[PDB]
Design a protein around this nucleic acid. Structure first.
Ligand code: FES
Ligand SMILES: [Mg+2]
Ligand SMILES: [Mg+2]
Ligand SMILES: [Mg+2]
Ligand SMILES: [Mg+2]
Ligand SMILES: [Mg+2]
Ligand SMILES: [Mg+2]
Lengths: 96, 98, 133, 137, 86
RNA sequence: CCCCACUAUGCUUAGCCCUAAACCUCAACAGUUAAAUCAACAAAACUGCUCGCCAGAACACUACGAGCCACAGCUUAAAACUCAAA
């Protein structure tokens, strides 16, 4: 009989979801990108429940932010005002 | 003599593939106030709210267009060894089948 | 009256044993019918088990060759604007027409999936069915 | 023009003005709201102390000193002494989470000064010194 | 101390609405965790107590999320009875 | 217990001391999920193999001996009297 099902991997398998930064290089010198994941008012680094990043890229962003802050590329206690008008990628609203 | 394997292979439900975001025709078979129970040929019916636009046309036997999301709504919860089912399909009511 | 130990044996074995032992004076009405036409499995109680380790359910996923084609279709031409009618036992979707034409082109021609895809699309458009990518 | 909740940047030229002066020229009201006292000092943009008033300098003593009414009185008096020096607009900078954090600002507004911006400067160490042990009450 | 002033934790007032600006500042300081940090730093929290507290809060959040998901999933069945009488 | 002040100590360097609810209170490797699942609770139930340890309570994280940079210390660790329980 030819009608029997055949062993096979799911062809309808949807691709696994990817974070916004997947495949992209995160550099401590790219302060513009790093500033998109810190609080505008306190400079505190957002958690992954806000940034939506995967664990690997969350760690990469955290390390890059600390490196840039200590090496004299990024402010610590606030987000640099030059980057306040960049696209908002974090799921947080201060009702400001 | 057609075997069960051939029936399953050439069945429309088998041919449809994944049920997510598929347009189907359903038939209203029961109405409870503003809740319409619709069969679209699956194991379970789907229950939809009567639209506010031309709501009077939705009567028993009426043919409607649905966008399927799930053939059956199930989910496993904390501390359970088996899924919990509501015995209902998930669908979006689009309109009447002209 | 018979034993109420529903987890020991089955109703048939219990009734047969008690009839043989003299506890039951007469066989119940269903005993002869059961004995002449038994079920495929004797209804003995069993406690269902949770599986662990490498033990896996032996149920296989149902896949057919044309599913691959269907997948490509639903990713390229998207879900057909025409709606499915599952009540019709012989309903034929646009994807099913594409699958049939693909299989015919495969059987009357060569085996290169991409060429089969484009040839099938051309043939269906020639037939006169709209297929927006 | 959409109101910007963020302050102007001293570098970037902006059009916001208050009595013809820029943001970086307005006097600053530094409020220190401790747990038992509230101290308000008005200084210029060039750090010239204009007025100073706390809950202690206004006669309140001991536990009455760390109250909202005491902070309101201190704010009113600081606003008066600053009004006697040509201050109408101020930028507020609060430090501490004491009871008079808002009452002192209320007093400053009620004394005649206009508040254009609020800033928080409460000290938050990123784990510097070790605090004292919790009370066994 | 070494940073530029009047940028961090600074709110502008709109049309003299001082109270709205102050409440927005309170909202920001609470959402960024600074209020909780200041309140927790008044006295020293022992490392073991800190670890226990964080574990408890994480597990409580997870459990509450799961319970909320369960109730939201079972709220679909909550409607008018369709087979009244039988 | 609350408030204030201030030591040994918490730190660095070089040596000691060798103790913890040093706990996942689960010994290491390999395998199984079929059985009757299974005293109970903890943390689903077991199998093969190896090492370590345990044979009523208390006396006893004790005495003596031995070893130790330790000298009010650590490791190892009893017996007599007593009880019908623990
Ligand atoms: S999802 Fe791939 S790097 Fe984040
Ligand atoms: Mg000292
Ligand atoms: Mg433990
Ligand atoms: Mg070992
Ligand atoms: Mg000891
Ligand atoms: Mg000795
Ligand atoms: Mg000893």
């Amino acid at each position: 009989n030819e009608d029997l099902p055949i062993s096979m991997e799911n062809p309808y398998k949807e691709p696994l979801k990817k974070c916004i930064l997947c495949g992209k290089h995160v550099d401590y010198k790219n302060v513009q990108l790093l500033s998109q994941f810190v609080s505008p008012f306190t400079g505190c680094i957002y958690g992954r429940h806000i940034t939506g990043l995967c664990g690997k890229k969350q760690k990469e962003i955290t390390k890059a932010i600390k490196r840039a802050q200590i090496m004299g590329f990024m402010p610590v206690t606030y987000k640099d005002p030059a980057y306040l008008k960049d696209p908002k990628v974090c799921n947080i609203r201060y009702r400001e | 003599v057609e075997s069960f394997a051939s029936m399953l292979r050439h069945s429309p439900l088998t041919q449809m593939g994944p049920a997510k975001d598929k347009l189907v025709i359903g038939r209203i078979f029961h109405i409870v106030e503003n809740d319409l129970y619709i069969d679209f040929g699956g194991k379970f019916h789907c229950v939809c709210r009567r639209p506010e636009v031309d709501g009077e046309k939705y009567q028993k036997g009426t043919r409607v267009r649905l966008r399927l999301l799930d053939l059956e709504l199930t989910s496993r919860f904390l501390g359970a060894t088996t899924d919990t089912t509501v015995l209902e399909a998930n669908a979006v009511l689009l309109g009447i089948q002209e | 009256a018979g034993s109420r130990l529903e987890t020991v044996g089955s109703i048939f074995s219990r009734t047969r044993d008690l009839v043989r032992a003299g506890v039951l004076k007469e066989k119940p009405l269903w005993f002869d019918v059961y004995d002449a036409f038994p079920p495929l499995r004797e209804p003995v109680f069993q406690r269902p088990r949770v599986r662990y380790g490498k033990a896996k359910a032996p149920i296989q996923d149902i896949w057919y060759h044309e599913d691959r084609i269907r997948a490509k279709f639903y990713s390229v031409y998207g879900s057909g604007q025409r709606a499915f009618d599952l009540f019709n036992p012989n309903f034929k979707s646009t994807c099913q027409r594409f699958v049939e034409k693909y299989t015919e082109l495969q059987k009357l021609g060569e085996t290169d999936e991409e060429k089969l895809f484009v040839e099938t699309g051309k043939a269906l458009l020639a037939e006169g069915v709209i297929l927006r990518r | 023009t959409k109101f910007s909740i963020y302050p102007p940047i001293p570098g970037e030229e902006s059009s916001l003005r208050w009595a013809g002066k820029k943001f970086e020229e307005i006097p600053i009201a530094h409020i220190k709201a401790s747990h038992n006292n509230t101290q308000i000092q008005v200084v210029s943009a060039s750090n010239e102390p204009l007025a100073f008033a706390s809950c202690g300098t206004e006669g309140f003593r001991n536990a009455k000193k760390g109250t909202g009414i005491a902070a309101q009185t201190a704010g009113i008096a600081a606003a008066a002494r600053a009004k006697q020096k040509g201050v109408i607009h101020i930028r507020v900078v609060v430090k501490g989470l004491g009871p008079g954090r808002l009452s002192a600002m209320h007093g400053l507004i009620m004394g005649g000064l206009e508040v254009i911006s609020i800033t928080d400067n409460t000290p938050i160490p990123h784990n510097g010194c070790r605090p004292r042990k919790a009370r066994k009450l | 101390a070494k940073h530029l002033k009047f940028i961090a934790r600074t709110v502008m007032v709109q049309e003299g609405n001082v109270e709205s600006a102050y409440r927005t500042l309170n909202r920001i300081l609470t959402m960024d965790g600074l209020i909780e940090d200041i309140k927790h730093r008044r006295y020293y929290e022992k490392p073991c107590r800190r670890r226990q507290r964080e574990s408890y809060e994480r597990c409580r959040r997870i459990y509450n999320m799961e319970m909320a998901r369960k109730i939201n999933f079972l709220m679909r069945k909550n409607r008018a009875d369709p087979w009244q009488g039988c």
